[PDB]
Design an enzyme around this catalytic site. Structure first.
Site, PDB file in Angstrom:
ATOM      1  N   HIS A  78     -22.324 -10.154  -9.009  1.00 24.45           N
ATOM      2  CA  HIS A  78     -22.287 -10.006  -7.560  1.00 24.45           C
ATOM      3  C   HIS A  78     -23.061  -8.761  -7.145  1.00 24.45           C
ATOM      4  O   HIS A  78     -22.718  -7.644  -7.546  1.00 24.45           O
ATOM      5  CB  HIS A  78     -20.843  -9.929  -7.070  1.00 24.45           C
ATOM      6  N   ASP A  81     -21.510 -15.490  -0.910  1.00 25.63           N
ATOM      7  CA  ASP A  81     -22.948 -15.706  -0.792  1.00 25.63           C
ATOM      8  C   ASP A  81     -23.331 -17.152  -1.086  1.00 25.63           C
ATOM      9  O   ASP A  81     -24.275 -17.674  -0.483  1.00 25.63           O
ATOM     10  CB  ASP A  81     -23.700 -14.747  -1.716  1.00 25.63           C
ATOM     11  N   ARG A  85     -21.211   6.849 -10.616  1.00 27.93           N
ATOM     12  CA  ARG A  85     -20.769   5.459 -10.582  1.00 27.93           C
ATOM     13  C   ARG A  85     -19.753   5.177 -11.678  1.00 27.93           C
ATOM     14  O   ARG A  85     -18.840   4.365 -11.486  1.00 27.93           O
ATOM     15  CB  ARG A  85     -21.969   4.521 -10.712  1.00 27.93           C
ATOM     16  N   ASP A 128       0.873  -1.167   0.000  1.00 25.89           N
ATOM     17  CA  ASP A 128       0.000   0.000   0.000  1.00 25.89           C
ATOM     18  C   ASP A 128       0.912   1.220   0.000  1.00 25.89           C
ATOM     19  O   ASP A 128       2.138   1.086  -0.021  1.00 25.89           O
ATOM     20  CB  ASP A 128      -0.962  -0.014   1.193  1.00 25.89           C
ATOM     21  N   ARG A 133     -22.790 -19.170   2.138  1.00 26.38           N
ATOM     22  CA  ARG A 133     -23.882 -18.934   3.078  1.00 26.38           C
ATOM     23  C   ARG A 133     -25.167 -19.595   2.597  1.00 26.38           C
ATOM     24  O   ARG A 133     -25.903 -20.190   3.393  1.00 26.38           O
ATOM     25  CB  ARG A 133     -24.094 -17.432   3.273  1.00 26.38           C
ATOM     26  N   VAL A 174     -16.856  -6.320  -8.503  1.00 30.19           N
ATOM     27  CA  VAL A 174     -15.838  -7.331  -8.772  1.00 30.19           C
ATOM     28  C   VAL A 174     -15.923  -7.844 -10.206  1.00 30.19           C
ATOM     29  O   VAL A 174     -14.901  -8.207 -10.800  1.00 30.19           O
ATOM     30  CB  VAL A 174     -15.944  -8.476  -7.744  1.00 30.19           C
TER      31      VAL A 174
END
Ligand SMILES: [Tb+3]
Ligand SMILES: [Tb+3]
Ligand SMILES: [Tb+3]
Ligand SMILES: [Tb+3]
Ligand SMILES: [Tb+3]
Ligand SMILES: [Tb+3]
Ligand SMILES: [Tb+3]
Ligand SMILES: [Tb+3]
Ligand SMILES: [Tb+3]
Ligand SMILES: [Tb+3]
Ligand SMILES: [Tb+3]
Ligand SMILES: [Tb+3]
Lengths: 329, 329, 329, 329
Positions: free
Chosen positions: C193, C166, C106, C52, C169, C140
């Site tokens: 996603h 997801d 966006r 970083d 889960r 992503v």
């Protein structure tokens, strides 16, 4: 086929051809089979070769191992030889040997097992030059020294099972007496594997504290009886296994596996394996069990223990008798 | 003593007296010893009792196990009986049995092993009333049903090793053919353990995809040969182990250990263990291997597989012959 | 020094200079730090580089990690860059990105993160040519496709975190409803996603059984409500984490670690990672999440799922909108 | 429902209602979140309660943890309080506290954190009477003694994180210098956690051998510089983490998890946790870090170290200053 289930990706590169961690067990009697079963369950090797005389049993054992593999991590278990399937193995574990015939001399049994080793080690030197040889055949101190002289390998890569098994039981029994984690105890059993192995009470240590803070004579009477009974319990267990069962297989198999772990995982872990004595306590030209740092390339370092006068005399006596027995062979 | 090393804390309370996860293996031949060695290395139980006839071997095996314990997680391994050391065990694993004498009838060997079970199960009912009984003695489907009728236990707690071993090999061989994680394959071998066990090709599944998307006849010829050769490889392996070695010990030992894991860890895992058939496919009053959810209290649920017409006929034929054999006993 | 403690063995050979399993995380915000902490505890790499901007925080985080290492398996954790410490890394995990400014479009946030990737990926192409790039930055699917076009790497080695989190889960919630081992459930969440990801009910499978044996309309009303509530619970959890916390870090960190496990251990495991669509369902020139076999060299195979007509239309709609958004950049 | 997939067995008994291993973390700042993430990944508890002031962040963190659980062993993670969800917890880990305001006295910050503890410990005494309290808030020695006086619990169950973290780094750095397994080194850092903690060079031990065989003055000059630089490296690391990052979270989180492991698994493991001094070295009525055997019921035994004259004087000086600071509160 099966492209209607799994569609292969054209851009996918071929998998890497990594070198497998590879071992070979020579002699698949009760000891070798116990070693194999343990090393398979504990996932020591990527490829494990089992070498013994060609029989339906050996192949049946291999197929028995292969059929149960789905329940444990994978290992390419197979029957084979050093010159073929076992070339360039990382570790060569030798349990091969013959049983003492009725009325056979102890020197005669040695010369028979030594002759068995000479045929075995010729292939090991030729096809496994960089391998570590783990000797388990009894007497392990004599067979380890014979392996060193026959192979000419560096003394760091000739390792015998030694007193690793009894030291671990010694360590665990002492920690159980004190209600403490066994990894906090450093208590070694050294010398010749058998009834004459020496417990190093002078340096026995628990979490930094000396079990014998001054001398053994200064210890309270009840502590001397309790400590002596713990080592006696270790020697009674090893003798009773041979008396009741005829031999050890499961215990020595787990101890042998533990030595393999320290080697393959480069653990630099202290083990009382049998190995060449090179000057310490004035002892030369013989194999004894001494605490040593064991890692990928074998015996890397030696714990420079300061023995008491009584402990050192017992060690030098065992060295004298082992050198005499080997000279007679 | 040793208060100069470790000073006990007066305010420290006594440790809790927790109930140990406790198992007992009955019959310590080659199968039982393989089970014991595996379950010790894989740390299945806190306390493991080994029951067989009183001999120096059994005690020697126990002492061999005990001497090697320091290298693996601790387990209170011991020799004993159901009525004494093994009271209120969580799992009772029965491998006991006798070998077929020269010229002995198959019905005679059954009546001998059934008589062995009647003496064993009388102690299990009396002193292990809440235990799960894991039957391994061959023929496992007959012995599992005999155990259910002798004990009177709930059918959920009478479990036979069944086809768990062959199903795992079947699953692993299929995944190896497709270069995929074996946990992505659900392919079951059901029915009577032996040469007549049935592979459920109709529902064989890989990551959600059906291996047989329509019917078996619709599959390409090369896929039918490859899939049939994989199941044939499973049956060849089980037969060759008995032919070359005389028996299986390591494979069945790992499969038996895997069943114990699902029970003791409440994994609710699908296993083709042998158990009582209760209405499915019109089959009653017999034990067969069917995929079942296995957890702490035994067979909790059954996978309600829809078999093809050919698969179901083979299953009902095996049920018919097993009921006939048991009626003759 | 210290030769009075440990005596070095002269015959001991030098240890092998093995190539370490090496990863680098780019972007050490909350997501990257969560990935690092998990991958250190779970011992994914032999050497882990954290890249970083040069700050006292990054170095403080690295020193915080380094100081706690004695409690977990060793990992050579360090701060560095791709061109220096991170050369020839096995896996490059990119979490870098910037937050959406007040009133920022966006498309403006995408062009900012894409510019961040162009400077990053230039070093990756030059110094990590054989590496697998694991993209985590949101969105992503867009960032994974941008990484593929910028690097020119084989599409098998450009992998996005996708719907892996997801799906896991989803799989676990379905198995909990049925009291069964979650590894017996193959239920995938595919597509883009976010709120428009598609649960593949048509092929959802439990131990070989189809959750939807015929069509969804044929299911009983209560099962349709229960199954729909389970997927809704998955989408509510992902939304509420962003609403209550502002972002996910621990969940995506564990999912990212799980993808790394499948790669480094060559597990050939089915994962709904994001990757290039190449013909399936007529979809091209875009990245979506589809069940794929992931191993050492990345996306090796693709599960050739047959979607229902409704499921496929939702997937092609997401592909259309993702291609439109990228064309505008 | 779903009985067409899984058919429930009517004879199946209900699962046992076992008591879960249960912990609660109080204070979910950076330290508490690091503890939680580690203890979840390492599967310490069956049920873990997170207590802090009611916020969207705490609930968002809990939901972030819950959403990632499928990738690790299960844990019933939840937000709650001692009086409700956390009743009868096995371990209570307290990281709660407030930061020193601009110009606030060190005694003022203590009285603020002590007031925070009084409200917390009132619920712990009432609803977790048999629990072990693990104190992490700084200064850990003062807060551990305050917790003992506020709760009135047995001194064996009031445990502070102490110097466990620095001792582990000290042990690992020394073993790295000697190319040996770190478990072979017993070297303790004792006393007050901070810049005045004392390395016990006099009893530092490597595999049974004393690092200082006679006195420190007798050591060669280069060994004295190397050993002193290793402890200085430990103190530099702890200081630089606070200087560069502002605080430690990942290191203390792993150290705290390690203490939990010794407790919940009854490991009887030696840890330099902070605890009540009761007569050793003439020290009373204060909390210091001393090597202690830690198990299920807390501090069970104390390693009765014999310190050098210089080491003991530093320890008694730290005890004097800690007693003075607490008397002023
Ligand atoms: Tb080489
Ligand atoms: Tb005791
Ligand atoms: Tb001497
Ligand atoms: Tb009960
Ligand atoms: Tb292949
Ligand atoms: Tb029918
Ligand atoms: Tb390369
Ligand atoms: Tb339920
Ligand atoms: Tb289509
Ligand atoms: Tb209680
Ligand atoms: Tb070095
Ligand atoms: Tb004194």
């Amino acid at each position: 086929m099966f492209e209607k289930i799994l569609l292969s990706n054209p851009s996918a590169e071929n998998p890497s051809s990594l070198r497998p961690r590879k071992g070979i067990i020579i002699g698949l009697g009760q000891v070798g089979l116990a070693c194999a079963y343990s090393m398979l369950i504990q996932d020591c090797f990527d490829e494990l070769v089992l070498q013994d005389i060609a029989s339906d049993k050996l192949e049946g054992e291999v197929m028995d191992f292969s059929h149960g593999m789905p329940f444990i991590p994978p290992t390419d278990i197979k029957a084979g030889t050093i010159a073929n399937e076992g070339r360039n193995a990382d570790i060569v574990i030798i349990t091969a040997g013959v049983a003492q015939k009725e009325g056979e001399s102890r020197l005669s049994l040695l010369e028979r097992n030594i002759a068995i080793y000479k045929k075995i080690l010729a292939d090991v030197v030729k096809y496994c030059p960089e391998a570590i040889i783990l000797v388990v055949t009894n007497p392990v101190d004599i067979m380890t020294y014979a392996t060193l002289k026959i192979t000419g390998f560096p003394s760091s890569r000739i390792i015998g099972s030694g007193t690793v098994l009894d030291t671990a039981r010694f360590r665990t029994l002492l920690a159980k007496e004190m209600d403490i984690d066994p990894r906090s105890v450093h208590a070694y059993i050294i010398g010749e594997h058998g009834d004459s192995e020496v417990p190093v009470w002078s340096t026995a240590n628990v979490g930094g504290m000396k079990l014998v803070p001054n001398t053994w004579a200064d210890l309270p009477e009840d502590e001397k009886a309790t400590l002596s009974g713990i080592f006696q319990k270790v020697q009674n267990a090893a003798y009773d296994i041979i008396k009741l069962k005829g031999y050890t297989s499961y215990a020595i198999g787990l101890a042998t596996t533990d030595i393999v772990k320290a080697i393959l995982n480069s653990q630099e872990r202290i083990l009382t394996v049998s190995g060449l004595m090179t000057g310490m306590y004035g002892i030369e030209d013989v194999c004894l069990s001494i605490p040593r740092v064991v890692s990928e390339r074998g015996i890397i370092k030696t714990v420079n223990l300061t023995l008491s006068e009584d402990e050192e005399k017992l060690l030098q006596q065992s060295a004298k008798m082992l050198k005499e027995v080997f000279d007679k062979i």
